[PDB]
Amino acid sequence: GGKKKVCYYYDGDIGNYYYGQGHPMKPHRIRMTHNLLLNYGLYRKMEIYRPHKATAEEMTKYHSDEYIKFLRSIRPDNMSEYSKQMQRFNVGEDCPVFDGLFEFCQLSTGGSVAGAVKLNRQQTDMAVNWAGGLHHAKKSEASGFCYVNDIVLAILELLKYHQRVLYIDIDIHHGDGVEEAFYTTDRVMTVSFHKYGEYFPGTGDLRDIGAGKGKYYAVNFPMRDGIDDESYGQIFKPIISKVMEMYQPSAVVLQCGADSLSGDRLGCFNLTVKGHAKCVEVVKTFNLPLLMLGGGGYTIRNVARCWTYETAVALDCEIPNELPYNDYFEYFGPDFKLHISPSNMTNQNTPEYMEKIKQRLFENLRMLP
C-alpha cells in the first residue's frame, strides 16, 4: 500500500496540566513523547499541527449540555459549591478537578476531531493524536481519568463520510465509553482487547456483544495477567483480519493505550513496545483511513518509547535503538534504549485459552452479513 502521509496533533501546553499530588495520570508523558520523536528527526517526515480547542458545541454532539456545562464551570477555587454536582458527574477523586481541566479536555478533544476532519477531507492517510484516546468518559459522567470522550466525538465525525467505522482498543482497560456510545448500532464496530476479572472498569465480558441493531457489532477479548508478545500476536492479526473481512469498514480508529506494556504502574500485562507496535503494523497493512490515539500508560518512560516507536511505524521509518539525546534523557536510564524487555511474570493466558476465546469470537463474527 506504500508509505503513508502522516498528520500529527500536539499542543505544547498539554504537559503543563497536573492531575495532582500522587495521581498516576501525567499529561507530561505526551511532551516527553513529543520531544523524543522530535530528536529522532521524525518531524522531517510528517505534518505537525497544533489542535484548536474543541468547543462545548463540539463536545455536546455526544455529551449532555449539563455535564459539559459543569466541566466548564468547576474549578478548585469553587469546589465546595458543587459537591452534589461533582458526585453526580463522578468528578472528585479518580477524575480530580485541576487547574485548566476544561482546556485540557479541549486540546485532548481538538486533536482527535481535527484528525477525523483531516481524514474526512482525504488530506492524510493517518492522523495521530497521542493526547486523545480517553475511552472511559461517558455521556454525563467522567470515569477512569477521562472527562470528555474524544474518540466517540471523532467517530461521530467519521460517520459523516463513512458508513462503517472500526474502533480497536489495545489499552489494557476495556473501552466501555466507546462501546457504550455505539452499543446499539452497526455503523460502528468496537473491538477491545483487555484485562478482565476484578479490574477497572469491570465490563468487557466475552458475552458483551452489542444489542438491538448492533448485536454482534461489539467484540471483547478478555485476558488475564501477564500476556506477552507471542500470545498477543497469536490472536490479534487473525481477529483483526476476520473483522476486516466481515465488517468492511472504510475508516479505523486505533486507541494505543500504553498501559498494556510490561512494567506499567497500573497494568498487569507483559508486552514490549515491539509487541505493542505490532498491532499498529497489522492495522496499517489494511490501507484504510486510520486515526491513531493514546490512552492509558503510567510508566512514562515506557509510554514515551511506545508512542515514539509507533509514530515511526506510522512512517515506516526505521529508528535506532540508541535513544537520541533529549530534554528528558535521564528518565530513560539505566539503559537509554528505545526498546524494553519483558519481565519474568507468569503469563496466566494459556495458549489454549487464547485459542478458545478466538474461536468463540469467530463464531460471533460468522453472524454478520
Which residue's CB is nearer to Ca ion, number 167 or number 309?
167
From 34, 136, 194, 276, the catalytic residue: 136
The verdict on whether residue 335 carries a ligand-binding annotation is no
The verdict on whether residue 173 carries a ligand-binding annotation is yes
Q: Residue 89: name the closest of 150, 45, 148 by CA.
A: 148
Q: How far apart are CA 59 and CA 105, in angstroms?
A: 9
Helix, strand, or coil (residue 40)? coil
Residues at the site binding Ca ion, with contacts judged by CB under 5 A: 169, 171, 182, 188, 192, 194, 214, 217-218
Indicate the residue whose CB is closest to Ca ion.
217
Q: How far apart are CA 37 and CA 221, in angstroms?
A: 31
Least separation in angstroms between residue 292's CB and Ca ion is: 14
Residues at the site binding Zn ion, with contacts judged by CB under 5 A: 171, 173, 257, 259, 296
The verdict on whether residue 165 carries a ligand-binding annotation is no
Q: How far apart are CA 156 and CA 291, in angstroms?
A: 13
Least separation in angstroms between residue 136's CB and Zn ion is: 8
The verdict on whether residue 193 carries a ligand-binding annotation is yes
Q: Residue 313: name the closest of 364, 352, 274 by CA.
A: 274
> How far, rounded to the nearest angstrom, does the alpha carbon of residue 361 sit from its chain's CA centroid?
22
Q: Residue 318: name the closest of 298, 339, 303, 340 by CA.
A: 339
Which residue's CB is nearer to Ca ion, number 139 or number 337?
139
Which residue's CB is nearer to Ca ion, number 105 or number 172?
172
Q: How far apart are CA 229 and CA 271, in angstroms?
A: 5
The verdict on whether residue 150 carries a ligand-binding annotation is no
Q: How far apart are CA 16 and CA 274, in angstroms?
A: 29
Which residue's CB is nearer to Zn ion, number 6 or number 256?
256
Among Ca ion, Zn ion, none, residue 296 binds (CB under 5-8 Å by kind): Zn ion
Which residue's CB is nearer to Ca ion, number 106 or number 192?
192
Q: Which residues contact 339 (CB under 8 A, 6 or more apart)?
A: 272, 273, 274, 305, 309, 321
Least separation in angstroms between residue 151's CB and Ca ion is: 12
Q: How far apart are CA 264 and CA 245, in angstroms?
A: 33
The verdict on whether residue 265 carries a ligand-binding annotation is yes
The verdict on whether residue 77 carries a ligand-binding annotation is no
Where helices occur in 10-79 by DSSP H, the ranges are 28-39, 56-59, 65-73
Q: How far apart are CA 178 and CA 150, in angstroms?
A: 10
Side chain identity at residue 227, one-letter code: I
Which residue's CB is nearer to Ca ion, number 6 or number 256?
256
Least separation in angstroms between residue 173's CB and Zn ion is: 3
Least separation in angstroms between residue 184's CB and Ca ion is: 7
Among Zn ion, Ca ion, none, residue 214 binds (CB under 5-8 Å by kind): Ca ion
Length of the chain: 369
Least separation in angstroms between residue 144's CB and Zn ion is: 7
Among Ca ion, Zn ion, none, residue 259 binds (CB under 5-8 Å by kind): Zn ion
Known active-site residue 136: yes
Indicate the residue whose CB is closest to Zn ion.
296
The beta strands (E) that lie in the chain are given as: 6-9, 47-49, 126-129, 165-169, 188-195, 218-223, 251-255, 290-293
Binding residues for Zn(2+) are 171, 173, 259
Binding residues are 22, 26, 169, 171, 173, 182, 185, 188, 192-193, 217, 259, 265
Binding residues for Ca(2+) are 169, 171, 173, 182, 185, 188, 192-193, 217
Catalytically active residues are 136
